[PDB]
Design a protein around this ligand. Structure first.
Ligand SMILES: O=C(CCC(F)(F)F)N1CCC(c2nc(-c3nccs3)no2)CC1
Ligand SMILES: O=C(CCC(F)(F)F)N1CCC(c2nc(-c3nccs3)no2)CC1
Lengths: 184, 184
């Protein structure tokens, strides 16, 4: 199973999921094709599992943090920059699969809701302690900022035109987060 | 031609481009199917033209503006909220078509570059006159803010989970723009 997952992530670096066959996956894993079907129903199920592992790893890293204001936010944004930036091929294939796969769509949406709720809870705590002003509803502010990070990180990692260069994206997002949370 | 375009926009309200046939389009336009092929090579070419007209209408409305700081930005963001919000079916189909169509991809990318360049020029003017502090590189700040607006507007219009409610999205974006441009 782990060899099929590593193989899939390796090939995804080079080509889209549409250009990878079960045969390629089976072969890279040192197993036959019907032996593949024993571990996964499809190549789409492989990507789902890869995406699930990356998002959970980001989510666990953020839990570890939960357990200087600008540096506080930078470190939390950085969990996502590093975790997804270390898995760009999976990130990119997984984002494209939100369009065609309900399971990938639901997976992404469920974790965005969780990460928005955590951001909102931290902004509310900051407001409760007098460190942040009561401007926008916290949960709405958190939603826009998180959607910004999703779109901006993924555009930078994919080398999209337009995008912020990967080496400038963390400072760019942290500035927008800190000014909008503390400003006002 | 205009009847084929209106028909396509009308049907897109109800269903995806994949569930619309040339026959549906031809029929709604009061023409035969080979008569359709005379005006457009495909249903994908129809969406391209619809998207082209919407983006140009937004772009022309923003030119009209180019020819109170918070209200200045609100009015510019509002061109996009109203123009795309008045054409949600076309916006939504057009965004999904960026994945499968190079012409739709290039069209969106070309206008984002133009709208980023305009935002950056206004922030630079604001900094030149002493009204905004010299924090992030203007063009990087503009890129992240514009990508935020793209993702956040389209999520609100599609009723995505998560999204900012459509009735709160303009105030949410304006707050993030004004604090990040003038803050720090
Ligand atoms: O960037 C994200 C998530 C959106 C993305 F596309 F990237 F998946 N976040 C979500 C969690 C945010 C957050 N950080 C923290 C904290 N960081 C440090 C202490 S508490 N709380 O919420 C950081 C940015
Ligand atoms: O929201 C956008 C474009 C991104 C989108 F997804 F929506 F297409 N804009 C681009 C242009 C921005 C802008 N406004 C202005 C001005 N508004 C009033 C005077 S000058 N300059 O740039 C406003 C937000």
């Amino acid at each position: 199973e782990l060899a099929i997952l590593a193989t899939a992530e390796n090939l995804l670096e080079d080509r889209p999921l549409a250009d990878i066959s079960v045969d390629d996956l089976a072969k890279g894993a040192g197993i036959s094709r019907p032996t593949f079907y024993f571990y996964f129903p499809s190549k789409e199920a492989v990507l789902l599992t890869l995406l699930d592992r990356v998002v959970n790893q980001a989510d666990m890293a953020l839990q570890t943090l939960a357990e200087d204001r600008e540096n506080m936010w930078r470190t939390g944004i950085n969990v996502f920059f590093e975790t997804f930036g270390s898995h760009k091929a999976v990130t990119r294939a997984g984002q494209a699969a939100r369009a065609t796969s309900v399971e990938v769509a639901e997976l992404w949406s469920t974790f965005m809701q969780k990460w928005i709720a955590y951001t909102a809870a931290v902004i509310d705590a900051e407001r409760d302690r007098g460190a942040a002003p009561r401007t926008l509803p916290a949960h709405e502010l958190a939603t826009a900022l998180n959607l910004m990070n999703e779109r901006t990180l993924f555009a930078s990692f994919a080398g999209e035109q337009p995008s912020v260069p990967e080496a400038r994206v963390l400072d760019t997002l942290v500035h927008i987060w800190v000014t909008s949370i503390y400003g006002e």
